Structures are given as structure tokens and as C-alpha cells.
Amino acid sequence: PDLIFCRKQAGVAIGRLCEKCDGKCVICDSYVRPCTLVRICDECNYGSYQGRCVICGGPGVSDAYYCKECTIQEKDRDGCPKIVNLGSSKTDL
Amino acid sequence: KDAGNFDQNKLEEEMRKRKERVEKWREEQRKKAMENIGELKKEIEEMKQGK
Amino acid sequence: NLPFLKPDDIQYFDKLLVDVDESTLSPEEQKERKIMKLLLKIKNGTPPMRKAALRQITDKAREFGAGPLFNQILPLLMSPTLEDQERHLLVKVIDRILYKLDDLVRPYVHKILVVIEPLLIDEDYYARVEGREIISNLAKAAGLATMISTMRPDIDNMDEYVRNTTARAFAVVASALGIPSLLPFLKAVCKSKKSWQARHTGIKIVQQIAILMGCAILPHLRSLVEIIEHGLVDEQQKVRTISALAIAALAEAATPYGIESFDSVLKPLWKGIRQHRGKGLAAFLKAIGYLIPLMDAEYANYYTREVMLILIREFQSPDEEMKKIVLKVVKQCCGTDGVEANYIKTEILPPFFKHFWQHRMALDRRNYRQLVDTTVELANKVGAAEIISRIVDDLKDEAEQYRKMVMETIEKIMGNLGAADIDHKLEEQLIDGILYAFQEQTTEDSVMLNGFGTVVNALGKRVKPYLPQICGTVLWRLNNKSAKVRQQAADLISRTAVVMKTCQEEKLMGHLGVVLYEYLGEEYPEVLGSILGALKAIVNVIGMHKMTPPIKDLLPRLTPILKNRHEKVQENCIDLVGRIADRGAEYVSAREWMRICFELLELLKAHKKAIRRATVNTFGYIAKAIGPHDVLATLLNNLKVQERQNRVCTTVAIAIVAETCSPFTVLPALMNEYRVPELNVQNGVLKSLSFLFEYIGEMGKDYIYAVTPLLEDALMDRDLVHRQTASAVVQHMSLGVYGFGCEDSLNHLLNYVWPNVFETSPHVIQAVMGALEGLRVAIGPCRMLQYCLQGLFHPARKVRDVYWKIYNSIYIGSQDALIAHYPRIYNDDKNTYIRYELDYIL
Amino acid sequence: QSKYIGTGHADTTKWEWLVNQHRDSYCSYMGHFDLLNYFAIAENESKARVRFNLMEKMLQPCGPPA
Numbered sequence A: 001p002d003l004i005f006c007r008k009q010a011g012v013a014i015g016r017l018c019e020k021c022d023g024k025c026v027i028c029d030s031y032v033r034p035c036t037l038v039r040i041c042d043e044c045n046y047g048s049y050q051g052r053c054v055i056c057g058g059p060g061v062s063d064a065y066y067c068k069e070c071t072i073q074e075k076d077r078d079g080c081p082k083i084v085n086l087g088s089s090k091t092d093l
Numbered sequence B: 001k002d003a004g005n006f007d008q009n010k011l012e013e014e015m016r017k018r019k020e021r022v023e024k025w026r027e028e029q030r031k032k033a034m035e036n037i038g039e040l041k042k043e044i045e046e047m048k049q050g051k
Numbered sequence C: 001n002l003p004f005l006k007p008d009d010i011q012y013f014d015k016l017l018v019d020v021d022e023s024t025l026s027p028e029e030q031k032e033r034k035i036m037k038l039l040l041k042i043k044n045g046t047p048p049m050r051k052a053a054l055r056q057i058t059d060k061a062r063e064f065g066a067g068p069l070f071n072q073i074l075p076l077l078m079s080p081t082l083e084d085q086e087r088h089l090l091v092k093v094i095d096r097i098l099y100k101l102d103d104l105v106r107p108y109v110h111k112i113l114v115v116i117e118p119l120l121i122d123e124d125y126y127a128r129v130e131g132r133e134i135i136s137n138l139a140k141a142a143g144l145a146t147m148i149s150t151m152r153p154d155i156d157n158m159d160e161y162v163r164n165t166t167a168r169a170f171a172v173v174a175s176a177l178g179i180p181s182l183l184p185f186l187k188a189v190c191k192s193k194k195s196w197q198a199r200h201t202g203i204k205i206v207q208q209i210a211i212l213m214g215c216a217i218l219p220h221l222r223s224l225v226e227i228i229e230h231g232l233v234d235e236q237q238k239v240r241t242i243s244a245l246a247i248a249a250l251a252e253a254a255t256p257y258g259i260e261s262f263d264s265v266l267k268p269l270w271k272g273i274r275q276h277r278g279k280g281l282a283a284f285l286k287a288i289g290y291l292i293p294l295m296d297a298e299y300a301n302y303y304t305r306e307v308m309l310i311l312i313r314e315f316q317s318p319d320e321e322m323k324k325i326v327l328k329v330v331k332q333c334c335g336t337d338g339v340e341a342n343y344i345k346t347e348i349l350p351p352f353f354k355h356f357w358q359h360r361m362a363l364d365r366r367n368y369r370q371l372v373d374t375t376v377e378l379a380n381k382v383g384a385a386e387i388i389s390r391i392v393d394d395l396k397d398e399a400e401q402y403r404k405m406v407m408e409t410i411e412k413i414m415g416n417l418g419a420a421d422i423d424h425k426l427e428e429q430l431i432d433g434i435l436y437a438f439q440e441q442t443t444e445d446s447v448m449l450n451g452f453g454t455v456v457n458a459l460g461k462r463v464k465p466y467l468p469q470i471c472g473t474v475l476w477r478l479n480n481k482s483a484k485v486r487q488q489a490a491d492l493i494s495r496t497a498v499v500m501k502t503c504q505e506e507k508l509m510g511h512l513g514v515v516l517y518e519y520l521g522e523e524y525p526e527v528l529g530s531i532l533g534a535l536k537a538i539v540n541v542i543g544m545h546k547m548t549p550p551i552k553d554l555l556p557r558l559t560p561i562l563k564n565r566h567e568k569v570q571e572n573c574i575d576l577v578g579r580i581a582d583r584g585a586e587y588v589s590a591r592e593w594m595r596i597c598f599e600l601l602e603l604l605k606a607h608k609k610a611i612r613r614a615t616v617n618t619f620g621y622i623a624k625a626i627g628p629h630d631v632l633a634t635l636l637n638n639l640k641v642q643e644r645q646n647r648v649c650t651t652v653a654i655a656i657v658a659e660t661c662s663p664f665t666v667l668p669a670l671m672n673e674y675r676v677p678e679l680n681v682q683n684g685v686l687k688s689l690s691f692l693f694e695y696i697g698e699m700g701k702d703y704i705y706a707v708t709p710l711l712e713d714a715l716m717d718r719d720l721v722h723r724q725t726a727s728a729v730v731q732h733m734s735l736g737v738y739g740f741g742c743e744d745s746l747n748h749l750l751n752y753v754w755p756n757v758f759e760t761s762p763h764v765i766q767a768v769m770g771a772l773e774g775l776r777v778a779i780g781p782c783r784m785l786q787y788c789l790q791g792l793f794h795p796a797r798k799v800r801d802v803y804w805k806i807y808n809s810i811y812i813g814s815q816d817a818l819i820a821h822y823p824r825i826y827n828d829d830k831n832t833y834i835r836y837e838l839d840y841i842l
Numbered sequence D: 001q002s003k004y005i006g007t008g009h010a011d012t013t014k015w016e017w018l019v020n021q022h023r024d025s026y027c028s029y030m031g032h033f034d035l036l037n038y039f040a041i042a043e044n045e046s047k048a049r050v051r052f053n054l055m056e057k058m059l060q061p062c063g064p065p066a
Ligand SMILES: [Zn+2]
Pocket: A017, A018, A019, A020, A021, A022, A053, A054, A055, A056, A057, A058
């Protein structure tokens, strides 16, 4: 259960999340004390990708944040925090 | 409360009456206006007149 | 091992399905056709397997043949089966082919121009963006001369759609191949007098380029105006309208500043306002509406005075194209700083109130929006009181259609200006109109519901003298027993609850509470949520026992309401139960509060985050009112029950106690819970301490040395599951005590956490890896790297695999912070290893 | 490109470790102010001089087998 991420050039696009995956951070995966807002790359909001959850990968209901234990560790300064892997790729069910 | 409720009802009735009066006044004003407008009577086809 | 095939890709699916031997017996370079099947691999297949096809075709497009390559690539995306992601992939492939086949794309210019043209005029913005990108790529592939020779003879399309498509294609080609690169050719081909087609297409391409570029029309502003000024005094009215549209588009693109080039046609724009007829005057007004805000302050008044001769006179528009243009021009003029509020109140207020401010547009949606926006924009300049005392009739009118727009405009004006410009008679008239609109709400008009709260907020302290009016209104709207009516009444009461109930009356509290708790069993969940919100607002404004419903009765009445599965109902009930214990908070038996807490403990991890936040907001006050010891003992006893599918939430509740009470309220009580020799008792205690130190915040620095041995004894070689818990506790306490002066206990814990690095459990290394990644960022690499330096070159192949990983984890974090932390690597005879550039004495 | 550049792995040679050490220790010299105004006082050279020296030393410092 090792989830992968895009980790591309963090553009000027804000993050999102689903109705159930809105609290936890896109990387820390915790509901405790959101610190900063998450972002996405250019290939994360493009046509069909407009307003999609960064964890559930579906509808967006809020803005994707990072956990305070994940922003103090400088984890938010990485690439696109979109949860995408070989299984969770573009051509997924 | 057997007197307070009655008072409230009376107040409501008064309010309703006032509203009715206002409506009547508005209607009268509209009627008066219909006496003469108003930008140029039916100013709608004047600006159009074909195309 | 690609995925399954599909019947929609049967155009070239004979490679992996049939015996299509292009190398055995087939035409020359027939394998490129199989490359189309490879394109299917880019569409149908894996992400890396799909990108490999593009990476290979990038180095093979030059040796594939431009003709067949284009003939196979264009129809692939021209078909309606080009999905969004499929369209993006096809666009990327075409761009790569053009970047590879630069000169070869010239003969295919007639193809993409016939394909990318409709796609650029699609409905979705993504389709138009992809079409513009494809057109720009095709233009950059060949030279500007090819694009000119392609788009020039395409003007013979008599169809208006084809002409607009050709104009947009030329504009897109010029927006990427250089505006001045195609400016002279276009100006030389369009400045003639062949027919109206070319004269219209010139202005069309100009407007399309100005719209596609955007803010990039600053340098080419005058360069384009010099060629566009030939239509300002054009003979044909169509050419004049096209020139006016192009000028308006350029002014909107180059706005707001930079009106120097606008002076080149500013004189005709200000003169022909009352000179043209019909479409000409309409286009002139549309251009002036954009040129006015960009104009200066001196000539702006003259331009407005010259345009008012044909604007205010023709305010009543026979059609919509004139009315919308006049409304937009009036809005733009009101936005400009030239015409002050005095001129607007003198020559703009009476005409706008006579020809526009009326109920004659009770059904035009576009007009109802445009007039409302213009009024909201002009109210800030002409004063809210100037319109608050002049729009108290459209809302009170019997016509609900125009009444909705009137109430919307009134709410917008109240939200923009506020409540300063509110006269006594004006305030009374507004209150009467709002009451008449709310009472005469024959339809589902949410505008009045949204404006009632704004009006109540604008009332402020004046709502106290106007108390009984709104009170009777809410009573008549609540006792109506209508579902939607009761919902709207509850919403309006909750919006204006703090303004009315908090007026220091102590008389309407009972009358409100008697009707609040009456309809407690509403079958409609929305009405139940609205009633719960109204009761919460009343309990926030009222006190104990100032509230009409008794606490000892509302508590047991609201208890089963929290058990409901409704989202909004439960979300409101949680806040209601929390605020019930807000001010006085006793108002209950301890058993009832304990049962409520045990019931709410299962909702602390709901899907909706609002319920999860409300549960934590209420449980804090619940535990503060009940007691530390009782709640702690209840949570501890609840640890064994509720097996690990929702058990962890109970631990979070314990953390809530740590967030609700002092640290010594759960520390000494939870410490005795570790003396039990049970495995999954100490395990649960550690799992709870994890979330405790992860949510306690900066309070761990006050008491961290007393919890060090409790974590050290659990970090020992006890089991394989009692190790992740201690490491998680350490990592969530280090980040919480970051730089607060508790590094001693951190070192004590790290002494034990380090030897646990050697663990082959794939699910147990992350619990120590995260601990190390937290300790690097909360301790400084000067000591973590000091530990991790001894084995950086250890002989064991499976010992460096962890040391180098920990070093990488401590390197990306504090990259330059560890530079002044390394030892002095002595100099060998084969190189210069010592960093002598840092051993100076200055 | 930027996957993990800055550190080797399980069988990283000592020379290839010291090379990255110096290559990432000069960037804290050309960028940091106290450790750049302190070296221009010892060598008695201007900021541009010392910075160009450190930049040219990034070709293959520490003793290159080139
Ligand atoms: Zn989600």
C-alpha cells in the first residue's frame, strides 16, 4: 500500500478533495491541524481534470491542504501532490 | 396567556390592513401613469422599425 | 501485455488482431500505419507504454513520410470518438510531429486548417484551447508565408460560419507567428475594395486576434488601429459595425490604461454617437462603453456628454441588442471616475429611474440580471439612500416576477453600501416592502429569504424598535405549517436571530421557544435541520433558564434527534448539544451526558468533515462539564469494546480530553493503564498516546520528561506491533515540541528509537522511517547525521541499504543545514578531500 | 534530473561522496552571506573574484580523475 504521486512542477493551481477525502492531507493523510493549502501541476487541472479531489480522484468539495506535521517537515515543497501511480494513472476505471 | 395572544392577533390584523392600503395606493399610481408615459408611449418598435 | 481491445478502434486494429504484415508484403513504409496501432497503444495501454510510443515517434517522424503520416494522424482525431484525454493525446502527438516535421507540414496545411478550424470553434473551452494550440503548432511548423497563402484564398467561403472560422484561424496563426509578422500582409490584402467579404473578414480577424492574445495588444495597439481606422468612416454599414466591434475588442483587451492609440479614433467614436442609425449607433455606443473607462479624466466628461445625446434619448430599446449595450455602457460610465455622482444624479438618475427603474422587465432573465448589476454598480456612486428611498415600490408590488428582481437589487445595494444611507422614512418604507414581499411569497423566491437577513443586519440597533413587526412576520410564517414556508421561515429566523433575540428584551424568548420545540418531529429533514439551527441560535442568544424550552426537557428531547442519520440534521444537532453546555452547561444528569458522549463517539469519523468538526467542538465542552476522571475512565473502558473498525476514534476522544482539559487530566490516568500486562491493552494505550501527542500541539513541552519512560519501556524489544506505536508517538511529539526546549527527552527517546532501524518488516520500517524523518527536522542534522555517519560505508551490503536511505532522508531535508555538520575528511595522496576553504582565521 | 541528485546510495564511492559534498558546500558559499563575506576577508579578494573562483572550482573539485 505505497501510494505514488505526480511530483511535477507545482503550478498556480489550488488543491481539492472529495466529500469523504477532504479532511486528511494529500501526503500526510491526517486530519490533525491543516497548515497550508495543497497545489497541483499543469497536467492536474486540464479539461476533465478541472476540480478533482487529490485523494479520492473524483469530485472536489473543498481545497486540498497539508498536515501541520507534513508542512513543518517541508514535505509540501515537493512536486504535484496528486495521488497518482501505475494503478491510479490516467487510464484508470 | 389569554390576553397577550389576542393583542398579537390584533397587531397582525392591523399590519395586514396597512399592507392592503399600500397595495391600493400603488394600483392608483399605476392607473394615473397609464394616463400618459413614459419615454415615448410604446418606445419598442420606434428604435427597431425593421433592421 | 497491453489491455483488451475495443470495437471503436477498428480503423487500424488489424495489427494485433489480424495478419497485417507490413514488412512481409505491403507498400513502402507501411509500418507507419502500424504506428497508428502504436497510437492505440498510446491511447489503449499503460502510461509508460503509451509515452514510449510518442518518444519513439519523435525520433521517427522524419523517416515516416509527411503525406501518409498526416493522412493517418488527422482523421484519427477528426472522428467524433476523440475523447477529452484522447483529444489531449492527439494534440500532443500532432505537436510532436510538427516539431519533428517542420517543413513537411507545409503541404498538409490545407488539412489541419480544415480540421483544426471547427475544433477551435467548439463549445467547450478545452476544445477551443486545443484547436488554438494545434493551429499555433501548425503555424510554427511552416513559415508565415505558408499560413498566409493558406488563409488568404480561404476567404471565398460565402458562409458566415466558414468566414468566421477562417478569420479565427488567421487570428490564431498571427497570435503565435508574430503579430507584426502578419500585420503588413493582412493590411495589404484587406485594405483593398474587392467586396464586403474581405472588408468584414479583416475586422473579424483583428477582433479574433485581439481576443485570443489578451493583454498582449499593448505594443500592437496603435499598429492595429492604423489599419482598423479605415472602417470608422466606412461607406458600408457592415464594415463600420465590424470596425466598431474590433475597436471595442481592442479597447477591452488593452484596458484600462494606454488610451493613446484610442485617440486615433477617439474623435469619430465621440462624434458618431448621435450620427449613425440603427446598427451603426449601436456599434458606436458599444465601442464608447469600452473606451470611456480607459479614457482620461478631462475628455471623459466631454465624451459622456456627446454620447448622452443618443444614449439617454434611446434608453428605451426596441430590441435586446440595444438595451443590453446601453446597460453595459451605463455601467462602464458609472465605473469611470470622470462623471461624478452629481452629474449622475442630475442627468443619469432621473432617466435611469424613468426608462429603466420599473417593473417592465419582470420576465427578461438577461435584462433582469443586467439592470440589477447596473443598479448595484451605480448605487455605490449615487448613494444608497438615493435608491433605498426609490425602490421601495417594486418589491411591495403584487407582481412577484419583478418583485424578485427588485428584492435582489435591494439586497445587493444593502450588501454593497451597508446601512449608513438609511433614512427613517426610507427605513420604514424598506421594512414595509420587505414584509409585504415575504408575506406575498406566492412562489419559491429565495431572493427575499437572502435579503431579509441582510436587511436585519443593516438594522443593527434599530431592529429593537422594529421588533414586533418582524416578530409577527416570523410568527405568521412559522405557524403557516407549510413545508417550504416553514423552512424559509426557520432560515430567516436563524439568519436574524442574534440581531433580534440579543436586543435585551426578555419578552419574546418564551414566545419563540414555545413554537421552536413544538414542531420537533418534522418528517422533512431540511425543516428539522432548520428548526435545529433556529433552536441553536436561540440558545446562543438566550440563557438558562432564560430560554423558553426547559433545559431538562430540551436535552432528552434533543437526545434521540442526534441518533438520526440525516447529514444536515445531525450536523445541526451536534452544535445544538454543544451550545446547550456553552454558558451554564450543567443542565443535565451525568448519566445523560455520558450516554450522549458514548453515542457521539461513533460519529467522530463521519464522511462529512462538518460533522467530524462539530463532534470535536461539542465533546470538549461535554467533557469540561462532566468531569475529567469520569470521562477518562469511560474512554478507557471503551477501548476494549468497539473492535478496531471504529475503535481509534475513541482514542481521539481521549485526545479531546487532552484538548479539553489540562495535560495531567489524562496523563496520570492513562499511565496506570500501562501497568496491565495485556498485549493489546498497552498496544491501545500507545496507539492513543500517538494521537494524544499528535493533537496536543505545543503543550507537550510542559510535560514531556514524565512520559519519556512510558514510551521507552514500550519501545523496548517487546513485540512487532508495540514498536510502531512508540515510534509514532516520538515522531508526533518531536514535531509538536519543535524548538521549544525539550531536546533532552528527545535524545533519550532517540537512543532507543535508533536500534529499531534494523527491521525487515516492510510495514514496520515506515513507522521508524517517519520517526527518523521527523527527528531530522526537529533535532537538526548536527546530531542525527552524527549518529548515521559511523555506518555510511559499512561492509554489510544490507547495512548500507538502510544507512544510505536514512542519509537521503536527512539530506533532502536540511540540504545546506548539514554542510556545517560533516567531519574533516582527511586528504588522500590521490586527490584533495579536505575542505580547507573553511579553516580560516579572520 | 532532479530525482535524487545530491547523494549516492548503498555502494557510493568515497570520491563520489566528497565530490557531491564540495559541489553542494560551495552553493552554500556562493549564496550565503556570512560565509561569503568571511572568505573575501581571508583571501583579501572582492565578492566577484571569490565567487568566480568558487564557480570555476565546481568543474571537478576535491581532486578529479578527469
Ligand atoms: Zn477523496
